[PDB]
Design a protein that fits this description.
Chain C: Activates pre-mRNA splicing. May inhibit PP1 phosphatase activity. This is part of a larger assembly, with eight protein chains of seven kinds. Chain B is mostly helical. Chain B contains eight helices and four strands, in the order ααββααααββαα. In chain B, the strands form two sheets. In chain B, strands 1-2 form a two-stranded antiparallel sheet. A two-stranded antiparallel sheet of chain B has the order 3-4. The radius of gyration of chain B is 16 Å and the shape is globular. The longest helix of chain E has 11 residues. Chain F is mostly helical. Chain F has one helix and no strands. The chains are: A mainly alpha, B mainly alpha, C mainly alpha, D mainly alpha, E alpha+beta, F mainly alpha, G mainly alpha. Chains in contact: A-B, A-G, A-H, B-D, B-E, B-F, B-G, B-H, E-F, E-G, E-H, F-G, F-H, G-H. At the E-H interface, loops of E face loops of H. The complex binds inositol hexakisphosphate (IHP). The site of inositol hexakisphosphate has 9 residues of chain G, from helix 4 and helix 5. The site of inositol hexakisphosphate (IHP) has 9 residues of chain G, from helix 4 and helix 5. The structure holds three RNA strands.
RNA sequence: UUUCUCUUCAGAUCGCAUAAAUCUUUCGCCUUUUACUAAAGAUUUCCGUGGAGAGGAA
RNA sequence: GUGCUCGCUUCGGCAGCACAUAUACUAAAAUUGGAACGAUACAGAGGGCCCCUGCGCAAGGAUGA
RNA sequence: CUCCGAACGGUAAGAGCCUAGCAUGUAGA
């Protein structure tokens, strides 16, 4: 979502345009999507999926692939395209991949504040059913 | 009963399913002589019969708010909420006029602005006549091009307020 | 000033009396019982 | 004035009577007439037959 | 020149200064200029004595202070 | 009159098509008019050129309240229309300002048993 | 005007005692700790439109809980009747106190927000914007109908009307001599901010008193 | 980010989208803790930099989007900004003859403007009255004067975030 | 080095200005009240602010 | 899923190591029935409790033991 | 010489007929 930044972009911005705007179009489609069909909060799963995809892409470009410069790894977050605190959460060894909070224990929030996929793969998903009210991160 | 269509409705995100019209004018449509007949139920088919038998295109007249059967039938189709295929069939109908007019109107009030342009642009070539009732009861012969010009460019071409369709410049900068 | 309240109380009492008179021998009380 | 046969009532006005059978309890007892949205071909036939009968 | 009180018991006690031999369309223009509603939507009543948009003001013979129950179309 | 209808269908199509392009260029014309006024304000003339009209939508041709004629507010809700109903010079006595309000004994603001305010611009 | 401004200034200078109390009680600091709040970075016009829509939704749900199906706010927060309720209904809709005031406040707020929306949506876009804001504070002085719920407004409204001519005789001096000086809201907006900051608790109390009457009993 | 907008998708319905269960305190806190009219009366976007950020605490059901942000405009920079604006407004009042600023009621009598600017909002003229400064005398007050937060990446003129 | 959490002490124009309410007195009103007017004193509420543990990111 | 065993032993993998450990007024649903002092026809006035408007235990208006 | 106010004190009470936006989400076999 490109609105304005009161300045010019960095040098390596042209490479980001197509994939970034494809993901932004997916987000705009999921934002104006219909409510009929979403049970209670099913409409709020794919928005988290898209945000996760955007953070994944900008993080892979930041220093995982070492392609994006140091300006883009702060300017892309300086303007609104990804989350800095979320990537800081990814810096931990345990916080590999999960949503904001959909299967966490009693964190600062009464329901949870850790992650959607925070539950274990070896003991969670009681019996057989895996799901998450906030993001559905099975 | 005049609450919903049958049991459920994809709520138009603008204001509400039925309340896209002002509540005053809606309540006037209910308390009306024409609402007695044809309000027993009109889903998809009988709407076509009740539509072609009223050759007016107008809103409110009289000192009291006097709704035309044009406006009341627009509201009836609004409560019915037909599918887009029927509305597209009415939009592409050249023989009957006011059916196409109602298709355009409901598409303006029920539809994305992209589809609004896509289905209202080819209505910019009918130089034919259209009958419309002024607020003082007196009629006037108006061209259809003037009608769509007041619809898209102008606000409240009828008594209804329109839900702020975008400017063409932004869409031209972004899309078709 | 209190005369207004006194007249209002008198009018309320008279209205209650008239309502009781119309209801006691009402069509649903007297005339309805006239058929029984 | 106006008097219904199945509704078993009488309305002493015109507009007041018009707002009676359109959603009456006895009218409901006669049958549920909820507007069922017909198929897309329904409007097609409603247009074709009416153009063939009224016009033609 | 006349002062009229376009009144209502719903947060609209408006005081419009109408002309002597003026119509009511201009009076509705003033009522919208002081009330904040579209011109053609305003309605003026006094126990269902709906004043119309062509009957003049001196025709009914309104004078200073004649309040009018305001309603909307 | 089909030959006349198609002739006017272009008459309306030309005006409607002219309004579109006239609206697009107006954004540049407004910026260009500021640029023309920019150089006009810069090096046109030191108090030797106006090229203007001081145009206002509705001229409030006020008068002089007699002694305590109420401060009537026109209501600033609709003024872009430039309706002629506004140009009437609301400086007249409405209900009770017809009097002189000087022959009175000392003063009379309002005897309606509500004189919370106290002011008459003496100071 | 300057006399009234100096009067307010000196009366403010008098009632100035060192405040040291309240034990540092802060709001919007413990809400986020619970699951009844979430922080976000949303554009200002978006937040304003959201607040206006939320206020209209709240008032509409209030009027709908009362089963009054013959009233309408119209999104300018001008409560509009429908069919001349005069049998026993006009005695049922005599709010007078808080509905009137909340209506006036949300009307002012939504009006400012929609003005800036038209700015972003292709308004005059020039100094005409700030001129409009100056006229909007004049209208809050006069146009916005907040008199009935509170008559103490006239103090700050005379303050704003004096602040008006405090500027034009400092702005409309020289070439600009008659025309509408667009001015600024450096003082108007300031006064209304202080006003709302001081009067938040009154409406908190009135809603605490009213919501129990419309939701619990009497 | 966009959770708010989908949380606004419900404006009132018959248990369609969080209507029934999310109604009672959705009304209660909506009418009890307004506390946003003040913030909007205290978080003007500073029109010389009208691209404001406005962080917003929002109830989950969508009752109110409360603003937690507070303005901390630096006094002398603030006064210099509004003085430059004073000069430019005098200039625009002197030069222009016809002055259209009378759009008094917006929203068009029950036309909610929530469209095309509660969105991607392609239009963004944030260059309203930004005075063109010649970096010959106004150099040191140049790159930290048309930004509403001229302290973030300073580390010398700002104690912190 | 930078921030968020909070129990805690403020008589620094705690905030180079400035909101309201409650109570007690004194005026103007007054048809009853609520809304009121302009002066004094005190107690609270809200926009806040200052200085000191402990616990969480770069 | 992440990083690693001078692991089995390849760079295919096999086994192990440590981080991460329990959200869910569960259901997009189901059925369930009522109230205008509201329009219309009709005659056309000699002590507290239960309710409504309401911010004040300000004030105001009201049938039902 | 520009200071501009709102609510209550207000619409008799009545018997016959009629129409409706709203609300529960469960215990248990
Ligand atoms: O008509 P005047 O007695 O000369 O005073 C007017 C009047 O203000 P006041 O009536 O309160 O003194 C205008 O206010 P409004 O009538 O619009 O409410 C105001 O105009 P603005 O609203 O734009 O501020 C401004 O008039 P102007 O715009 O020409 O400056 C002002 O003083 P002047 O008319 O003497 O200039």
């Amino acid at each position: 979502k490109v609105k304005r930044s009161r300045k010019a972009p960095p040098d390596g911005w042209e490479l980001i345009e197509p994939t970034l705007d494809e993901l932004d179009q997916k987000m705009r489609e999921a934002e104006t999507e219909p409510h009929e069909g979403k049970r209670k909060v099913e409409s709020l799963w794919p928005i988290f999926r898209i945000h996760h995809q955007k953070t994944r892409y900008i993080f892979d470009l930041f220093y995982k692939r070492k392609a994006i410069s140091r300006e883009l790894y702060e300017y892309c977050i300086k303007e609104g395209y990804a989350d800095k605190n979320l990537i800081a959460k990814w810096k931990k060894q345990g916080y590999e991949n999960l949503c904001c909070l959909r299967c966490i224990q009693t964190r600062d929030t009464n329901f949870g504040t850790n992650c959607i996929c925070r539950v274990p793969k070896s003991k969670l998903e009681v019996g057989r059913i895996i799901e998450c009210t906030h993001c559905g991160c099975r | 009963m005049a609450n919903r269509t049958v049991k459920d409705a994809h709520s138009i995100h603008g204001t509400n399913p039925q309340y896209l019209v002002e509540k005053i004018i809606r309540t006037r449509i209910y308390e009306s002589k024409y609402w007695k007949e044809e309000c027993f139920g009109l889903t998809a088919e009988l709407v076509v019969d009740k539509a072609m038998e009223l050759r007016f295109v107008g809103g409110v007249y009289g000192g009291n708010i006097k709704p035309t059967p044009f406006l009341c039938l627009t509201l009836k189709m609004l409560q019915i909420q037909p599918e887009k295929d029927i509305i597209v069939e009415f939009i592409k109908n050249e023989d009957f006029k006011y059916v196409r007019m109602l298709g355009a109107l409901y598409m303006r009030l029920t539809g994305t602005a992209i589809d609004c342009y896509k289905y209202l642009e080819p209505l910019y070539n009918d130089y034919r006549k259209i009958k419309s009732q002024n607020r003082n009861g007196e009629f006037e012969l108006m061209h259809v091009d003037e009608f769509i010009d007041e619809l898209l460019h102008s606000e409240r071409v009828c008594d209804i307020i329109l839900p702020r369709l975008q400017k063409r410049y932004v869409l031209e900068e972004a899309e078709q | 000033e209190a005369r207004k309240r006194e007249l209002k109380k008198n009018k309320k009492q008279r209205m209650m009396v008239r309502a009781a008179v119309l209801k006691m021998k009402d069509p649903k009380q007297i005339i309805r019982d006239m058929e029984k | 004035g106006y008097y219904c046969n199945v509704c078993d009532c009488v309305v002493k006005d015109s507009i007041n009577f018009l707002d009676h059978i359109n959603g009456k309890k006895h009218q409901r007892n006669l049958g549920m007439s909820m507007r069922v949205e017909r198929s897309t071909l329904d409007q097609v036939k409603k247009r074709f037959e009416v153009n063939k009968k009224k016009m033609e | 020149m006349i002062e009229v009180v376009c009144n209502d018991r719903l947060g609209k006690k408006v005081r419009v200064k109408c002309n002597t031999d003026d119509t009511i369309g201009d009076l509705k223009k003033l009522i919208a200029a002081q009330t904040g509603t579209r011109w053609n939507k305003i309605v003026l009543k006094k126990w269902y004595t709906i004043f119309k948009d062509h009957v003049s003001l001196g025709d009914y013979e309104i004078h200073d202070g004649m309040n009018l129950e305001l309603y909307y179309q | 009159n089909d030959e006349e209808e198609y002739e006017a269908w272009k008459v309306r199509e030309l005006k409607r098509i002219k309004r579109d392009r006239e609206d697009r260029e107006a954004l540049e014309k407004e910026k260009a008019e500021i640029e023309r006024m920019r150089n006009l304000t810069e090096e046109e003339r030191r108090a030797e050129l106006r090229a203007n009209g001081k145009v206002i939508t509705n001229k409030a041709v006020k008068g002089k309240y007699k002694f305590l004629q109420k401060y009537y507010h026109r209501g600033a809700f609709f003024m872009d229309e430039d309706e002629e109903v506004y140009k009437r010079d609301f400086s007249a006595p409405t209900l009770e300002d017809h009097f002189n309000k000087t022959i009175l004994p000392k003063v009379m603001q309002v005897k309606n048993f509500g004189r919370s305010g106290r002011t008459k611009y003496t100071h | 005007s300057y006399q009234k401004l100096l009067k307010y200034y000196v009366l403010n200078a008098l009632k100035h005692r060192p405040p040291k109390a309240q034990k540092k009680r802060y709001l919007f600091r413990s809400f986020k700790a619970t699951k009844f709040f979430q922080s976000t970075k949303l554009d200002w016009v978006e937040v304003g439109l959201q607040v206006c829509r939320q206020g209209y939704n709240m008032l509409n749900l209030l009027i709908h809980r009362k089963n009054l199906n013959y009233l309408h706010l119209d999104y300018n927060f001008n409560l509009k009747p429908v069919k001349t309720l005069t049998t026993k209904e006009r005695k049922k809709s005599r709010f007078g106190n808080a509905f009137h005031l909340c209506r006036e406040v949300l009307r002012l707020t939504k009006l400012v927000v929609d003005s800036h929306v038209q700015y972003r949506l292709g308004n005059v876009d020039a100094f005409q914007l700030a001129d409009g804001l100056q006229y909007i504070f004049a209208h809050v002085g006069q146009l916005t109908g907040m008199y009935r719920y509170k008559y103490k407004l006239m103090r700050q409204i005379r303050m704003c009307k004096d602040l008006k001519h405090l500027i034009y005789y400092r702005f409309n001096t020289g070439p600009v001599g008659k025309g509408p000086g667009c001015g600024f809201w450096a003082a108007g907006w300031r006064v209304w901010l202080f006003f709302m900051r001081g009067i938040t608790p009154l409406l908190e109390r009135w809603l605490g008193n009213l919501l129990a009457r419309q939701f619990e009993g009497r | 980010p966009e959770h708010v907008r989908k949380i606004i998708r419900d404006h009132g319905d018959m248990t369609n989208r969080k209507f029934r269960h999310d109604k009672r305190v959705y009304l209660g806190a909506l009418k009890y803790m307004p506390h946003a009219v003040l913030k909007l009366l205290e978080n003007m976007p500073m029109p010389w930099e009208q691209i404001r950020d406005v962080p917003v605490l929002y109830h989950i059901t969508g009752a109110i989007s409360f603003v937690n942000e507070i303005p901390w405009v630096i006094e002398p920079v603030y006064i210099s900004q509004w003085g430059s604006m004073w000069i430019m407004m005098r200039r625009e009042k002197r030069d222009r003859r016809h002055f259209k600023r009378m759009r008094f009621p917006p929203f068009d009598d029950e036309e909610p403007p929530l469209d095309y600017a509660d969105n991607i909002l392609d239009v963004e003229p944030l260059e309203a009255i930004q005075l063109e400064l010649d970096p010959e005398e106004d150099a040191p007050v140049l790159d930290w004067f048309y930004d509403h937060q001229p302290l973030r990446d300073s580390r010398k003129y700002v104690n912190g975030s």
